[PDB]
Symmetry: D2
Subunit: 481 residues, 4 copies
């Protein structure tokens, strides 16, 4: 019937149009209440209990703010109430494809369980969306509020996942290209999804967010750029945009890639791999799926949430004993032990195809110290983390259009040297973390020696504590002294 | 083993002594990660995703702050490091006995499932604590850090639940009476547990907390009162104490007793009642328990969390169909419908023994109006809520001892009229909410006519929207205009 | 000329229309940068350095928010861009008449310096506004943006001060009556001025505000009430409105009437009285005024700010020696000493005409304790403070119109008993503070005996520390024992 | 005399020892209430009304936190209550030397008025401190609380200004070296002064601070480094330390060097230069000083505050007409106009001795565009701003000592490549801003052409809006295209 108000600690009072309420009040959407935003991060940062549900509300709210702000200041863009609703829906729905513990599922579990498939949460969001619509009779409701389902469903999916295949989009024409830059911005990654998570994650983690999305919204305008209408920021704000990506990188370094968070995600992934043959999830027509195959049936995937963790933990079946035991070690805080971190030097870049060979390389190192235990490849975990500004080696600010106060309809470019010499020289790097599955004192001492020796042999950077954890190894390396 | 630092969004960096870490890193404590602080409140306030776990860390931290502050200002009290740890442990552990959805479990479910038993979360905390200690070899660890288990375990339990029965306590002597006022203050309810939840619940709900616990700590002292050493507040702070209880009452009104939060707790309770025969929880020695009997075995209770909700929702067994269908209605937001609220007038006080008769009474009202449908007792839910300042009809500030700047060791009393005439004249009241299980438009119209007629017949207060929802009924009542 | 953005810590990014910018960029408006919001409160709460200038920006902003919100939800009201600008201007300009140290000037100094005149900051705001307009060529600028100066200048003044004398207003007709409720709400005091100062004063004082003005704005509507269009709140929000006035009262008790803040305001007022014959302020046509007569000439008043305080403090003229010495005692923190506080009982209400007799009464009390020193009337200060809900004895919520969800265009009333029995039974009271100008130990002891005896003789409430500060006096009073 | 509590919106309840209260309650300290922390920043960011007084309380509080934290963790350091108080005093007093509008006084005015003198606010703080102590009888009070004035006064001054002339300090010996790193850290700039102004300035400006000083305090330890006991940070925190300096730089870029804030500081400085021959400030024995010579007499300098601004503005003396007129233009917002910003390229570094030649260079540029007006050197202002990490070209993190969890007493170093490749390559740069004193449309157009042509001639970076403001000039430069 009518609009609803929701109170959110980040944004305050969010108004929801009744079509949005109908999308929200479904099993496919409400499911997001049972998926933690930060996965294993809650086990390090106890405030991070938030789930994808409330993040999705915030993304939909902000998407609506930005589109409304553009419309109000530039009526000549002809943004319709239909446009506004479609953008809010895409915003609400771009997290629907997340799986248990969020990035651990698409980032660790599925790549190990189903190495042959190419799955992303984005693709999952489109499939869940289609399933949500079809299972809940949403198309008639959309027509009731003036949407045109064929066009608008296409538009919504395109906002989430990009072109479903010269202007490549079918949901809207080039004169509305700027609409595609709101929810998931494939050109430079500046979108309302980051703005909600910066604010929400900081609130919960107890870390402070430096980025002012409202200021940015106020200074945003649409300008013509190479025969597209694109969103442009005020020239002055270029520093704040660099700062936005800097904040993204700090949040990754301190929280999202926390070394213990990551190892908890890894352990949970391992328990899931060991339980995968025994857990059954009933999908369409009563067919049974596994944790690794629920992504093939949306009805099964609907029922795949963080509950899988507790189902395993609370199980009594002897078949689940191995999985259950890994989870029990998490509760007792008997975790795989962090050994250290290093980075490649020079132009060395570690390729994905080499990842599996790394633990073997570490166990093959020949440190000169007397060791009571010997460790094997299987005792080591090597995590390779690609840290960047969202576009691999590229500077995303080279893909942003700006305008000046004296000519607000004229788009310009601003280069790095026009801003500051104190900015980063590079935009991507790799971090390598090593952990040991043997947690006793002697094994850990040994693991350290192998680790630092491997760093030396590969010409990686000297670990920060290298001289303390491996004082007999670090003197060999001239470049470190 | 050394101290750990945890970052909490409410309190910042909390330091945890290694004994505390050992208590925390157990299944019995980690269980609290899977129990929402506010139960069905998350279904109204989407920021309220927090669980009892992080609340318990905060209660333990604040307990430590208060005891440390007292010791530092008054060395003559002889507060030992042992005392400090025992108070931190009680603080950490006073939420261990909570069940699924927190107050819904002890407040709605158990009273209906096991009407013959007298269960409280406090009692449950003592039992889970004992089980935690015993199952994890904590006593030797306590001795390692200078605790004396026999005395100190007793002291901890007493802080949580009160005397395990003229000085009634055995864990500490009258010399240390003030220590019993920190974690769970039976005398007037001013304790660190409230202070954490005020700040934490407000952070998550998106409502602002007006109470300054750090100011109160700074102004607190121990003074002799009737041959006990008790905590006294500075005279000046009496207004801020009344404001504390006022804030508690606002939080209940706006959030904890939100009409839709309460109906969701009621629907979930109903699903639990319908599933209770079929859900099995394995406890000690492989014995099986139900949701309603897990409270009799701590090993089973350890595994009784919010996960029960999803286990039901995801079930395929036809035996669980009824329970599962209620939960499905929650997801679709097809909830029982709020009809209205009223209060008794005069000295009328509704007794617990009469609660069951109320839906009958409503259905027996004879509104003088044309009705398409007739409703029966079973179509109505009547919720009676007792709102007070924590001590029934009493003013808790009558039970607080104060001191003056001119004589800091002399305790005094301050009465209501010494403070302000703008304070409440009563400290307890009752609210009556009525809901209808028939949700269609005609049933709801009818429910409104019965409801308002019943209010008129009983001489209850006029519902705020009475003239709008029942314009043909409200004219009959002279007292209402 | 285009819009400007200002960043405010309370409201974020505030957009200012160019007409508003022109009003702001005048000596009459910028003057507010040199008048502390809380006067002598900065000398107790060191974060309270804020001035009337930034408060005025915030009031203008919120005035705009509320009027825009109403227009967007109810287009049928025909709120024009002209209406919006007039309301923003009134909001911006309702503080223009404040004098040095804000309420100290109109509340203490002018009543003692010019007892024959009836001066308010509201009257001063109208005069300064007229002077601002005329001195800066604003009328042509107003016309340029579609305002009609004769009607609209009237309207703005009426919003600030009320009718400049059946519909009593000339700036707008009855169908726009709701516009008069925004900036300065004479009917019940619920206006945007309070909302900005609650948030701003809390931010600076270091106290937390619990009123959510944004929620209130979202729930506000215009409805017909007795043939006027008035602003109505949603029924549900009635609790929050009581809480609003409760917050106002707490802020007055903790901050705005802090006993030391008030004594500093008194000492400053005293210095101003002693300097008044000697300070010259040049006004229109070179005429000279005094501090007490600058209110008669807006050109002189433009130059009358907190700077008077420093002019006196830094003076070398022997004529200002007495004034300067009082200010020097403030810097050394040699302040008059607080003796205690009490309240009248029963029907007793202390009239303004009796205020001067009260120190005489205190010095006339006859304690019957042995005293080293005797004190005279001139050694005592007695401060009488009227605390209420903004309408003397009346409940302002009786003057608020509400609507219900089922009939949003139908206004209703809600009485106290329809809300809660835990609300105040009275809405006004008086506090009496007593201070001694003799600050030595023996004088202060004596002052305490006189004070408490005077309380006993007048049947005032027992001071909270009475038994400690005057143990030989309090036993005499049966009613206190 | 007992402790006082002050409530601060940044830190909460700060306890002040009575010796500190005595230092605070003097004309020399209370003077800081009348000096804005951010000077002309209040004229851009209206929330920035805060003064140096409340900043100084915060620096003293944090200095006490850090020293107390070190003592509690490491009793073997033998930090005494005497050490604690001396560090709190130095913290309280390190802002005493600030002049009107803070950095504008020492940063713009004194360098132009007294080019021969080398004045810093640091030197001024030492002088004011000595004068504060002597004028107010503080030495006996210090002895009363166990301080030893000769040693401890030396120690305090050394903390503020560095060695008053191998261990160069006399106030404390090398085993207490770490105490010198708290208030003003000459080695790397990581001190409690930054930490307070980050949090306080952000709170007031409406920008969010992302540095967590409390976390840093908790991780700090004293370790031996080259036969000194120095403060060491945990290795892990190195990222956060880089982020701290990054935050400092953002605050300078967005706020402290705001182009309009700076121009206001310049205009005020200009008014002060024009008033300097006519304003009189009475110092010791009735002698008169000027604004530029008050720094030579502490009794005069005590009375030199932001009041000087209003004294000029409110003056009637025809000798002050020129000064008064500049201030009046500030009120009307007729400010000098910003033309643009650029930076040097390559190894070009602009020296202080060249600053005065720059406007001449700009006016000598030869654009070869048709110009209606010609501009002269005196029409241009050129502001050169040095932005760095506090140590000119150096990386301050190269001057930080760290420790590892496995060996907490063993200090180590961490290099930039051990941390991240996404860090800055350089640590100092210069910004050049140009403004025009002729504010009309034709002058401003011309100014732009000269500016951009000058950039091209000097091989400076292309202004961001260069192509829009000077489309005929920017094509000439190949390097820009
Ligand atoms: N800040 C704040 N939030 C509130 C308060 N009361 C409820 N909420 C939150 C919970 C929800 O997220 C949102 C809306 O709840 P309401 O109680 O207004 O809506 P509800 O649908 O129960 O009422 P309605 O259908 O309009 O009668 O506001 C309040 O007093 N303050
Ligand atoms: N505020 C804040 N909290 C952090 C940051 N890094 C981690 N935390 C949180 C996560 C935890 O709740 C707590 C301690 O985490 P740490 O990373 O310091 O401890 P962890 O045990 O991983 O390191 P350690 O064993 O000392 O090497 O602080 C940070 O950069 N800022
Ligand atoms: N939150 C935030 N506020 C800022 C920042 N930069 C400036 N402000 C504040 C200062 C003012 O209150 C307001 C507008 O400042 P701007 O620098 O955008 O306006 P200005 O008139 O100087 O620039 P313009 O005339 O548009 O070139 O925003 C920023 O980076 N973050
Ligand atoms: N947060 C908070 N701050 C307060 C309150 N009352 C006063 N303050 C602030 C003002 C000052 O910065 C500081 C100390 O104020 P007090 O009223 O406790 O000190 P005062 O010296 O007036 O009392 P005393 O001499 O001890 O009777 O706390 C309050 O209720 N809450």
């Amino acid at each position: 019937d009518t609009m609803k108000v929701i109170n959110d600690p980040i944004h305050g009072h969010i108004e929801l149009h009744p079509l949005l309420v109908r999308i929200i009040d479904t099993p496919q959407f409400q499911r997001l209440r049972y998926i933690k935003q930060l996965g294993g991060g809650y086990y390090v940062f106890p405030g991070a209990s938030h789930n994808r549900f409330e993040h999705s509300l915030g993304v939909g709210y902000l998407a609506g703010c930005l589109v409304h702000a553009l419309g109000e200041k530039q009526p000549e863009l002809q943004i319709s109430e239909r446009d506004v609703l479609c953008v809010q829906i895409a915003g609400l729905c771009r997290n629907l494809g997340h799986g248990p513990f969020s990035h651990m599922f698409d980032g660790r579990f599925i790549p190990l369980a189903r190495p042959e498939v190419k799955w992303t949460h984005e693709q999952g969001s489109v499939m869940m969306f289609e399933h949500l619509i079809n299972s809940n009779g949403i198309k008639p409701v959309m027509e009731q509020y003036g949407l045109i389902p064929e066009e608008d469903i296409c538009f919504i999916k395109e906002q989430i996942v990009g072109p479903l295949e010269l202007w490549p989009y079918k949901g809207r024409p080039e004169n509305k290209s700027f609409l595609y830059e709101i929810v998931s911005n494939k050109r430079n990654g500046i979108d309302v999804d980051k703005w909600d998570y910066f604010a929400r994650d900081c609130h919960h983690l107890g870390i402070q967010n430096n980025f002012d999305y409202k200021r940015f919204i106020k200074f945003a305008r649409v300008c013509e750029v190479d025969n597209e209408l694109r969103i442009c920021a005020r020239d002055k704000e270029v520093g704040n945009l660099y700062d936005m990506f800097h904040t993204r990188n700090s949040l990754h370094r301190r929280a999202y890639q926390h070394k213990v968070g990551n190892i908890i995600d890894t352990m949970i992934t391992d328990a899931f791999l060991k339980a995968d043959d025994y857990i059954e999830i009933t999908g369409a027509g009563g067919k049974k799926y596994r944790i690794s195959t629920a992504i093939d049936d949306m009805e099964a995937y609907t029922k795949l949430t963080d509950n899988i963790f507790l189902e395993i933990l609370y199980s009594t079946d002897p078949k689940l004993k191995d999985a259950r035991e890994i989870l029990k070690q998490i509760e007792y805080r008997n975790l795989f032990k962090y050994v250290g971190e290093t980075q490649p030097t020079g132009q060395i870049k570690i390729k994905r195809e080499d990842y599996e060979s790394l633990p073997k390389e570490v166990a093959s190192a020949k440190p000169k110290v007397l060791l009571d235990v010997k460790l094997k490849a299987e005792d080591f975990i090597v995590d390779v983390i690609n840290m960047d500004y969202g576009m691999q080696e590229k500077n995303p600010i080279d893909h942003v259009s700006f305008y000046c106060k004296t000519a607000p309809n004229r788009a310009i470019r601003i280069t790095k040297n026009q801003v500051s010499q104190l900015l980063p020289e590079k935009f991507a790097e790799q971090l390598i973390r090593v952990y040991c599955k043997k947690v006793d004192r002697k094994s850990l001492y040994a693991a350290r020696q192998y680790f630092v020796q491997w760093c030396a042999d590969r010409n990686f950077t000297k670990p920060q504590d290298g001289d303390v954890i491996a004082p007999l190894i670090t003197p060999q390396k001239k470049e470190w002294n």
